Design a protein around this ligand. Structure first.
Ligand SMILES: *[C@@H]1O[C@H](CO)[C@@H](O)[C@H](O)[C@H]1NC(C)=O
Ligand SMILES: [Ca+2]
Ligand SMILES: [Cl-]
Ligand code: NA
Ligand code: NA
Ligand code: NA
Length: 496
């Protein structure tokens, strides 16, 4: 469960948030494969409620109607076509599994679903599965409202409705079996793992019972005995009885403290600074590296919907964001997930975005295709951060230095720091209000290296900054606090 099952030398996953299956299929072939990406986290592939008020919000996909692979991203055939084409070029697919609940208990009954399946929240009937009143936690939940009211009570957090979402009785073998049926079908057609949505809201033991029913990965694409990669969504910021460690027996856990803290130090909140990052990792109260799924921002908190709060850096903060993603991809801690978003009309009023519900770019509710511009950026309002040179090159940087230890750390006691990864890579950051100009020990072999942040290595030359490493491994770095990207990165494969 702990291993991502990516092809050897592939160390990251990209969340192609709300992308259609046909676009991901193409992306795997034209970009993800040749650029060394390990895999893709796809949006929930199961049928959900079609919500019109507001108009097709992104969150409607977290309100299941059935397990039919039929959504705005595509039908069952288009989904498998995607998994097959991606696997064929060595790029994995990870499914966002929404298995804790079905839709909101107040949603009107009918066929307002992405595949037309009928469902009646009020009567607890979802015939397409099928689920009935016997499969929900109505009787088990002890709160007066029936919803989660107090997180200091680990029981209601698991047995009551998350914001009114009908809560499945995951202790029942019938329910466990219907979920396993859905997940095994996905495994058998090729998915390499799952994001277990709302895991804090499920008992560690119930998740375990469901995982016990899962098959090994498709033996045509994966080695015999491969188990699906499992990363559970648990937002654990430290002040509750439920700890993400309670879920280690099932697989990895999302480390939401990661992006939260990286955001506060890079924004320099509360006197924090990059020099403090020398002991980044468990030293900051994070889960063990081998149990962490890390990221700077997620589809949830990039729009203030989850946790990490106001400190979270996103594509909106492009300059600082690239640097944060750069530090994450260079540092050995955890398994990295990079975000790929769509632009929405963010509109702040009293410090809150009233358009944080807005769904993916669409024409009358039909998600727009991802267009690729000549400069390799995306059109149709897809941000495509994974295509930003500064990020894509750090994804490659991570692959190049994989297995190499964190070494040669340097800091000016403020916000100018640097560190290397064995003798395969080195990165330098300047987040102070003044220039950084100094000779650093890089731990790299002598030679000329292309800085992969400002440019690229192209046919024996560099398009951007060049760094010269001497025989003792030292090299001079000069970064202005006014630089477009205040950080430089070089590695074994960017050497001329
Ligand atoms: C690098 O670029 C220069 C021109 O700027 C050219 O003379 C040289 O041959 C190029 N090197 C390679 C290896 O293509
Ligand atoms: Ca639950
Ligand atoms: Cl997440
Ligand atoms: Na392997
Ligand atoms: Na969630
Ligand atoms: Na095992």
């Amino acid at each position: 469960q702990y291993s991502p099952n990516t092809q050897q030398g592939r160390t990251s996953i990209v969340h192609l948030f709300e992308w259609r299956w046909v676009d991901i299929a193409l992306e795997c072939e034209r970009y993800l494969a040749p650029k060394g990406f390990g895999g893709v986290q796809v949006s929930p592939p199961n049928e959900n409620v079609a919500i019109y008020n507001p108009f097709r919000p992104w969150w409607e996909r977290y309100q299941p109607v059935s397990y039919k692979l039929c959504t705005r991203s595509g039908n069952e055939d288009e989904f498998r076509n995607m998994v097959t084409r991606c696997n064929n070029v060595g790029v994995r697919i990870y499914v966002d599994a929404v298995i804790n609940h079905m839709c909101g208990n107040a949603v009107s009954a009918g066929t307002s679903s992405t595949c037309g399946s009928y469902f009646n929240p009020g009567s607890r009937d979802f015939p397409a599965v099928p689920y009935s009143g016997w499969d929900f936690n109505d009787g088990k939940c002890k709160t007066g409202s029936g919803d989660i009211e107090n997180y200091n009570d680990a029981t209601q957090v698991r047995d009551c409705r998350l914001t009114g979402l009908l809560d499945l009785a995951l202790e029942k073998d019938y329910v466990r079996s219907k979920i396993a049926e859905y997940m095994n079908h996905l495994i058998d057609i090729g998915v390499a793992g799952f994001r277990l949505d709302a895991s804090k809201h499920m008992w560690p033991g119930d998740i375990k019972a469901i995982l016990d029913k899962l098959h090994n990965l498709n033996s045509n694409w994966f080695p015999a005995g491969s188990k699906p990669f499992i990363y559970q969504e648990v937002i654990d910021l430290g002040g509750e009885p439920i700890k993400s460690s309670d879920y280690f027996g099932n697989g990895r856990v999302t480390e939401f403290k990661y992006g939260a803290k990286l955001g506060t130090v890079i924004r320099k909140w509360n006197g924090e600074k990059m020099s403090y990052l020398k002991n980044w990792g468990e030293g900051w109260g994070f889960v063990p590296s081998d149990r962490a799924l890390v990221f700077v921002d997620s589809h949830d908190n990039q729009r203030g919907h989850g946790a990490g709060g106001a400190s979270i850096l996103t594509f909106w903060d492009a300059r600082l964001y690239k640097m944060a993603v750069g530090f994450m991809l260079a540092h050995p801690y955890g398994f990295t997930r990079v975000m790929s978003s769509y632009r929405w009309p963010r509109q702040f009023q009293n410090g809150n975005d009233v358009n944080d519900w807005v769904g993916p770019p669409n024409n009358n509710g039909v998600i727009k295709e991802v267009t690729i511009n000549p400069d390799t950026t995306c059109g149709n309002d897809w941000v495509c951060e994974h295509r930003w040179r500064q990020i894509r090159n750090m994804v490659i940087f991570r692959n190049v230095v994989d297995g190499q230890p964190f070494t040669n750390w340097y800091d000016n006691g403020s916000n100018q720091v640097a560190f290397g990864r064995g003798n395969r890579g080195f990165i330098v950051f300047n987040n102070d209000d003044w220039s950084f100009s100094l000779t650093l020990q890089t731990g790299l072999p002598a030679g000329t290296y292309c800085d992969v942040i400002s440019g690229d290595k192209i046919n024996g030359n560099c398009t951007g900054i060049k760094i010269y490493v001497s025989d003792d491994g030292k090299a001079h770095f000069s970064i202005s606090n006014s630089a477009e990207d205040p950080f430089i990165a070089i590695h074994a494969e960017s050497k001329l």
